[PDB]
Design a binder for this molecule. Structure first.
Ligand SMILES: [Mg+2]
Ligand SMILES: [Mg+2]
Ligand SMILES: [Mg+2]
Ligand SMILES: [Mg+2]
Ligand SMILES: [Mg+2]
Ligand SMILES: [Mg+2]
Ligand SMILES: [Mg+2]
Ligand SMILES: [Mg+2]
Ligand SMILES: [Mg+2]
Ligand SMILES: [Mg+2]
Ligand SMILES: [Mg+2]
Ligand SMILES: [Zn+2]
Ligand SMILES: [Zn+2]
Lengths: 114, 77, 177, 66, 82
RNA sequence: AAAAUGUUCU
RNA sequence: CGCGGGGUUGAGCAGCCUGGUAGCUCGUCGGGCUCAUAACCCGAAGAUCGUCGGUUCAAAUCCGGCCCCCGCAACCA
RNA sequence: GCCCGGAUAGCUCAGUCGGUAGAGCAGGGGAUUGAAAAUCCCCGUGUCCUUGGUUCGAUUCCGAGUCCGGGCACCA
RNA sequence: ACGACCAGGGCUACACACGUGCUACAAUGGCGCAUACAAAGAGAAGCGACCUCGCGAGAGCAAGCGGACCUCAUAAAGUGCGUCGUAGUCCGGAUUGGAGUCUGCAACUCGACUCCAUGAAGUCGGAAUCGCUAGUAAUCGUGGAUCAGAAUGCCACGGUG
RNA sequence: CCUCCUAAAGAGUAACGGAGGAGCACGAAGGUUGGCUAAUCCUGGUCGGACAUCAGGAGGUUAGUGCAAUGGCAUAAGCCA
């Protein structure tokens, strides 16, 4: 049960199972399923090889898994290089998107030390 | 011993102490700048500013080694 | 076996064409592929080590030599003569098969793969790589694995220069970067 | 090789999705159904595509068009 | 951010100044206050001294800085540490 | 059972 | 400079006690209780174990030297 | 080899003449108090020290030894 | 000049500590489709049906209504089927990358909302501590004010209970 | 009691001379037969780091010897079976 690199859960329903792939969430999974011609309810158990192949192909059509990671990462790197406000934020480990830092930055800040 | 003591005192004093027209880069004043520590110009025999990515401009003193290197690498900054 | 067959007739010929060697013995040949799983953290438990060994065996159909510590170090908390790794020296038909598997089947299975490192040849012609996740070999069953394990593959060859070795590798497909 | 205590090493039939039937000696036991091989996996096209991405001016132009 | 129908914003004065600079090709960093302005392709190569409230931080305009606003490369707050 | 204290001048 | 003992988290003590596990009380810091500080309650951080060599797989631990301390004996004419 | 005291739950200790796990304390939770003590409930965790053997298996009962305490006696 | 005008910046900073909220940790739940039942409000530089385009935020045309008429505006919990079967999960939505939409001279600092992707912590919370006696708490939504835009806040409204 | 030096190139050789060790250990760490060759260094390579394990080259006994030191030890007296 491999698709676009990584393994997919054998028991889980396709819509959800697909979501395991980095670069597909729910909507994209659904789209993929539609493209294939498969229902959402079916599992990877009771799913044919030919059927799988089509799905895989569909997935390939999107920028997914390692490629996506490479892209996003690259963007971040570029930003950092630029030294744009966003870049600066990224470098510091502070909220990029314009949040308060006085309090509640703990995701990007990390778990508080003192 | 006395001399040593005096020296110590002086050091202490120094420590205690420690505790924008300036550089008009190219006919436009009030540009974010700073003196570089490689060689620090005051009334020096001309200066040159490297337009950095962050922290604005770094003034180098004209005929510096670092500045020369920078020029060699890329003259447009 | 297939790979070996290919080599004798094609790869060697290619090498001859490109480098202009005097003899057919002068062409680089892969001498041994030496797999290594230096488990290390098996100091806590030997079951882990055993598992690793098993995995290695599965990957490459020999049974590994459990290499012990040569000298003691307290940084990793090991003694001399502690089972602290396992190796599989492959040679001949089996080795060839393994190589084929790696190049034709297993390297394609590498996660986030954009080719190998060409700048990794030791100086004296011999290549080495290392797989992050040992699942990439289809010999391992994903349901059975308990540890995110890995190994290093090591293609030793008769090549004098690194360049020659690289060429040889290329002749056996090998994507590089 | 020392008999008995090695694993079994049969010439199985690996068969990927893109019609490359591949007979190899392994210790899986069962016949193998692969995704990708050397004659399909993108280390030629993928590389090309990844490279062709970066650009800002072009994007700007597209956005605006004059 | 700004709508695609509305067209990417640039301060008029800066646009004019930039044009002049490009026309001449004379270098010499442009004093700018309008930080709210998308950098253009024509702005690449120039140095623009973007205000940060206090001073005009000189940004050398790279090819990668285009769709960004000027103020992005001109940090207003000067924080180091606590 | 155990519960101390409240800076000065207004 | 002869004999022993010691130097460890800010303080005091354990550990050393026969190398590989840094603990106890007070203090500190952040909460809480209170009107507020105490006391009390909860959570947390803290240590190249005098220093320098050495032995070692590795030292706080064993050994040497040096630095400071505390005992001590320094006598018979 | 003279005698006699002590080896279990995390720690300190009781105990069946062949079929099982029990106290006070520590630890978890709760009840209680305005708060904290002292309560008081409740669960909890143990190859009964290891290994042969009698036998239906057996902390239980036999064969097999270290460590500390006190006394007495040997020792070229 | 401690007066006045302007541009930009700041009031949104961030080792950190406290307060008040929201969202959670899930199965009394989520997700999917079908379907029922509110009240109260607001609205002409406004509210903006229907129709078309847009996956969607929204865009285009554009009636109606100073409004028991028209609009905001399909209430949501609920109910009926299906699915997931106790997982850091189809829980959770932080975060961040990309693409966008709207407002407004202007969304970089620094708006909201959308889409796709990403999918932190968190598995009911130490000491301590607050609210509430009935249509109350709890929970579910809906409106308003200010407001170009921008509420988990505030002020109201009903549902379940 | 052992090792070095002192000790004057046989032995021996004193000092409250200068240095360190022993009061054992091992039924394999002994016997033998067969085999193997080190420390370190470079480049490379899953987590893996200055330091585990694996490739090869340099290195050539710098190591090892159950423990002190000295003298020995590749024919190895070192390390495997
Ligand atoms: Mg995903
Ligand atoms: Mg202003
Ligand atoms: Mg404020
Ligand atoms: Mg309104
Ligand atoms: Mg969800
Ligand atoms: Mg977690
Ligand atoms: Mg009342
Ligand atoms: Mg509003
Ligand atoms: Mg002599
Ligand atoms: Mg003589
Ligand atoms: Mg290395
Ligand atoms: Zn200089
Ligand atoms: Zn294939």
């Amino acid at each position: 049960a491999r698709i676009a690199g990584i393994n997919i859960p054998d028991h889980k329903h396709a819509v959800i199972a697909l979501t395991s792939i980095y670069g597909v969430g729910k909507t994209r999974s659904k789209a993929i399923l539609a493209a294939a011609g498969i229902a959402e309810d079916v599992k990877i158990s009771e799913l044919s090889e030919g059927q799988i192949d089509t799905l895989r192909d569909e997935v390939a059509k999107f920028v997914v898994e390692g490629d996506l990671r490479r892209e996003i990462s690259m963007s971040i790197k570029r930003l950092m290089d630029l030294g744009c406000y966003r870049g600066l934020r990224h470098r510091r480990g502070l909220p990029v998107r314009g949040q308060r830092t006085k309090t509640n930055a703990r995701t990007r800040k990390g778990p508080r030390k003192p | 011993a006395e001399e040593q003591d005096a020296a110590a005192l002086k050091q202490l004093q120094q420590k205690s102490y420690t505790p924008n027209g300036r550089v008009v880069v190219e006919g436009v004043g009030n540009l974010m700048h700073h003196i570089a520590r490689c060689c620090q110009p005051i009334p020096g025999d001309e200066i040159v500013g490297f337009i950095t990515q962050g922290r604005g401009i770094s003034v180098h003193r004209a005929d510096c080694e670092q500045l020369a290197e920078l020029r060699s690498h890329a003259p447009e900054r | 076996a297939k790979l070996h067959d290919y080599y004798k007739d094609e790869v060697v010929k290619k090498l001859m064409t490109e480098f202009n060697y005097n003899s057919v013995m002068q062409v680089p040949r892969v001498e041994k592929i030496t797999l290594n799983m230096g488990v290390g953290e098996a100091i806590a438990d030997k079951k882990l080590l055993d598992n690793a060994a098993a995995d290695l065996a599965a990957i490459s159909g020999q049974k590994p030599l459990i290499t012990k510590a040569r000298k003691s170090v307290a940084g990793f908390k090991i003694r001399q003569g502690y089972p602290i790794g396992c190796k599989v020296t492959l040679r001949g038909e089996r080795m060839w098969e393994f190589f084929e598997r790696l190049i034709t089947i297993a390297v394609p299975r590498i996660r986030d793969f954009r080719g190998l490192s060409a700048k990794s040849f030791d100086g004296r012609g011999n290549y080495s790589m290392g797989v992050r996740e040992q699942i990439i070999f289809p010999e391992i069953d994903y349901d059975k694995v308990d540890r995110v394990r890995g190994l290093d593959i090591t293609i030793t060859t008769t090549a004098k220069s690194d360049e020659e070795g690289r060429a040889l590798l290329a002749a056996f497909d090998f994507p590089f970067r | 090789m020392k008999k008995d205590i090695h694993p079994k090493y049969e010439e199985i039939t690996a068969s990927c999705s893109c019609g490359n039937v591949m007979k190899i000696r392994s210790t899986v036991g069962h016949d193998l159904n692969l995704d990708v091989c050397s004659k399909c996996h993108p280390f030629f096209t993928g590389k090309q595509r990844d490279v062709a991405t970066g650009g800002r001016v072009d994007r700007f132009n597209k956005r605006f068009n004059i | 951010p700004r709508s695609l129908k509305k067209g990417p914003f640039i301060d008029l004065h800066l646009l004019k100044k930039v044009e002049k600079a490009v026309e001449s090709g004379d270098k010499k960093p442009l004093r700018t206050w309008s930080r709210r302005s998308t950098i253009f392709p024509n702005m690449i190569g120039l140095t623009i001294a973007v205000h940060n409230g206090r001073q005009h931080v000189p940004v050398f305009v790279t090819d990668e800085m285009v769709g960004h606003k000027l103020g992005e490369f001109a940090p207003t707050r000067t924080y180091r540490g606590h």
